[PDB]
Amino acid sequence: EISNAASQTCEFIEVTSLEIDECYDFLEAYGMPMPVGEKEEDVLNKTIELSSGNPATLMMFFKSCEPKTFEKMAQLNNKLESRGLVGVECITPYSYKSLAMALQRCVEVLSDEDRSALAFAVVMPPGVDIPVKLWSCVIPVLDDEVADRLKRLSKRGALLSGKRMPVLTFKIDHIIHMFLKHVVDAQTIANGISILEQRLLEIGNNNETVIRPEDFPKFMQLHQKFYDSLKNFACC
Amino acid sequence: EISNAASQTCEFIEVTSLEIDECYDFLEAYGMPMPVGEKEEDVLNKTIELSSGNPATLMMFFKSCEPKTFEKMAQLNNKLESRGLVGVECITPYSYKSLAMALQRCVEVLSDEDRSALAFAVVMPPGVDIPVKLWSCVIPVDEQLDDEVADRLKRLSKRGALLSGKRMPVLTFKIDHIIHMFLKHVVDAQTIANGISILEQRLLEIETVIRPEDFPKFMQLHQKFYDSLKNFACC
Amino acid sequence: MFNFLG
Amino acid sequence: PMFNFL
């Protein structure tokens, strides 16, 4: 948004997250052995999904992959889920020990209220497209205002992910998630989880390439699997 | 337990909670209009359940029933769950405005760990008889045999009569309603939600009737009295 | 933990 | 203490 400072021929070029093929290429480039078995190409889609297309964390991955095996690579695939970005923070061409140290700052500059919204998007599902109202449950203040915050939030460090149609929906990636995991107040995780089961049942009392229908928001139980893990995290 | 200090002729008389009938007698005793409609004897069995047979809070209750109507009596019955004992705290023959000032003391003297166990018995269902393992889930301890929970829940009933032990059919304790709603508006709003979730973990592994071991995995039977705490700790 | 012990 | 430093 700093470009709004300039009244001019402002032109823009966005560096997206490294697409899955470009990720293969980055691995190939420095001598990392490419898959065969299905749960190895899957292990690598696990890494690429986790490091939601991210140069720096990919490099930290290689640098921390010691023997080079897919096996010890999956070791890391665990470490990333049960230790967040701090599991793979390493000496890298990046000025930063870990992408989390960077995102820290990225999180500091934020409008106090946006700092709140972001702080809350933990208790969501990562790598999932979800409606504005479905977000209105955890986000502070017609709740379109949520969209204004979530837009500012992707605009200011590319922390979210907007997708206009089929329906105005947003989405949170994985690096940007495990940032928030081991970083937001351990309580506030469980508080956001509960505040969600609350408005969900609230909506309950009013009565793949497919978005979640308004007949079915009432059960976020679809993501119970990951939701159960988040719950296993906060309250211990 | 102070009696274990004395080596001598020791004899005991336990002042139990006012039985459902004696409360009627007590009501009649201080000019209380006796029910007619069904949802009036129900209003008063609601009071007797809520104030789990307790002279003092019952007296505070009359003293606070102002117009005398069963109506304002159900008003108080409401006032008690969503404002706690403070909805009926009054100038009473009791040295205390409300029973919370008493249990205060009863809770300070308590073994630190017992203070903890007690602090957690909030996240239960009140006026329900429930197993030791069903307690082992929420109650703290510094392996595989949890009788230590029972030892604590016993000290806890012996020492201010905060719980309620009941040997058979199966070794079970129980928390009453006043002794619960004490803890409601008094323990850390967090520790409640933490006990509810910390319960929802063990909650899966692999009427005048106790809950069977084929069915512990779903405490959802008591969903009502759990939806009220989840609603509570989110305010 | 215990709102002034009660 | 929501978040960390910050």
DSSP class of A188: H
CB A46 within 8 A of CB A174: no
The answer to whether the beta carbons of residues B140 and B120 sit under 8 Å apart is yes
Q: How far is A106 from chain D (nearest CA, A)?
A: 11
Distance CA A210, CA A157 (A): 27
Query: What span, in angstroms and rounded, lies between the C-alpha atoms of A123 and A192?
Result: 6
Name every chain A residue with its beta carbon within 8 A of the beta carbon of D3.
107, 115, 119, 183-185
Q: How far is C4 from chain B (nearest CA, A)?
A: 8
| Tokens at B152, concatenated | 């604590």
- Residues 6 or more apart whose CB falls under 8 angstroms from that of B95 comprise none
3-state SS record for A3-36: HHHCCCCCCCCCCCCCCHHHHHHHHHHCCCCCCC
Residues of C with Cβ-Cβ distance to B103 under 8 angstroms: 6
Give the integer Cα–Cα distance in Å for B53 and B64. 17
Chain B residue numbers touching C6 (CB-CB < 8 A): 100-101, 103-104, 107-108, 182, 186
| Residue A131: its H or E element | strand A130-131
Give bridge partners of residue B83 from the DSSP assignment: none
Task: State whether D2 and A104 contact (CB < 8 Å).
Answer: no
Q: Name the DSSP class of A61.
A: H
Cα angle, residue B194 at apex, residues B189 and B198 outer, rounded to 5°: 160
Please give the backbone phi and psi of residue B48, each rounded to the nearest 5 degrees, phi first.
-65, -35
Helix axis angle for A186-204 and B189-202, nearest 10°, is: 80
The string of DSSP codes covering A144-183 is: THHHHHHHHHHHTTS-S-EE-SSS-EE-B-SHHHHHHHTT
Nearest residue in chain D measured CA to CA from A105: D6
What gap in Å lies between CA B88 and CA B64, rounded to an integer? Answer: 6
Question: B221 is written with which tokens?
Answer: 């039977």
Q: Nearest residue on chain B to C2, judged by CA atoms?
A: B187
A53 dihedral zone (left: phi>0; alpha: psi -120 to 50; beta) = left
Size of interface A-B (CB pairs under 8 A): 26
In angstroms, the CA B125 to CA A27 distance is: 56
Contact by Cβ (8 Å): A64, A73: no
Resolution reading in Å: 3.4
Q: Which two tokens stand for residue B185?
A: 């508006």
B24 is in an annotated binding site: no
Q: What angle do CA B28, B30, B35 make, to 5 degrees?
A: 35
Interface contact A236, partner B, CB < 8 A: yes
Nearest CA in chain A to B191: A235
Distance from CA of A223 to the nearest CA of D (A): 25
**Degrees (nearest 5) of the Cα angle A187, B206, A190?**
10
- Burial group, residue A178, by CB count within 10 angstroms (0-12, 13-18, 19+): buried
Q: Hey, what are A188's tokens?
A: 């506030």
Rounded to an integer, what distance in angstroms lies between the CA atom of residue A96 and that of residue B19? Answer: 70
What SS3 state is found at A228? helix
B194 in contact with A, Cβ within 8 Å: yes
Question: How buried is A205 (Cβ within 10 angstroms: 0-12 exposed, 13-18 middle, 19+ buried)?
Answer: exposed
Q: Which of B198, B201, B230 sits opposite A194 (nearest CB)?
A: B230
Handedness of CA B155, B161, B164, B166 (dihedral sign): positive
A19-88 under CATH 3.40.800.10, yes or no: no
User: Judging by beta carbons within 10 Å of its beta carbon (0-12, 13-18, 19+), is residue B125 exposed, middle or buried?
Assistant: buried
Cα(A109)–Cα(A168) distance, integer angstroms: 26
Q: Taking a C-beta distance cutoff of 8 angstroms, is the pair B153, B173 a contact?
A: yes
Please, which residues 60-119 of chain B have a Cβ atom closer than 8 Å to chain C? 100-101, 103-104, 107-108, 115, 119
Q: Within an 8 Å CB–CB cutoff, is residue A191 touching chain B?
A: yes
* Two structure tokens written together for A66: 């010691």
> Is domain A98-236 classified as CATH 1.10.10.10?
yes
CA max distance for chain A = 58
CA distances from B96 to B56, B64, B105, B133, B179 (A): 9, 14, 12, 37, 16
Rg of chain C (C-alpha set): 4
Which residue's entry shows tokens 């069915």?
Answer: B215
A187 touches chain B (CB under 8 A): yes
For residues A131 and A169, is the Cβ–Cβ distance under 8 A? Answer: yes
Please report residues of A whose CB lies closer than 8 A to that of B194: 190, 235
- Distance CA(A64)–CA(B167), nearest Å, equals 58
For the CA atoms of A216, A219, A222, A226, what is the dihedral angle to 10 degrees? 140
Phi, psi of B64 (to 5 degrees): -115, 0
Q: How many helical (H) and strand (E) elements, i.e. helices and strands, does chain A have?
A: 11, 3
Given the DSSP bridges, would you call strands A169-170 and B165-166 parallel, antiparallel or unpaired?
unpaired
Question: Is there a binding annotation on residue A94?
Answer: yes
Distance from CA of B186 to the nearest CA of C (A): 5
Question: Exposed, middle or buried by CB within 10 Å (0-12, 13-18, 19+), for B29?
Answer: exposed
> Contact C2/B104, CB-based, under 8 Å?
no
- Experimental method for this entry? X-ray
Is residue B129 classed exposed, middle or buried when 0-12, 13-18 and 19+ CB atoms within 10 A define those classes?
A: middle
Burial label, A15 (beta-carbon count in 10 A; 0-12, 13-18, 19+)? exposed
A168: amino acid identity, one letter: L
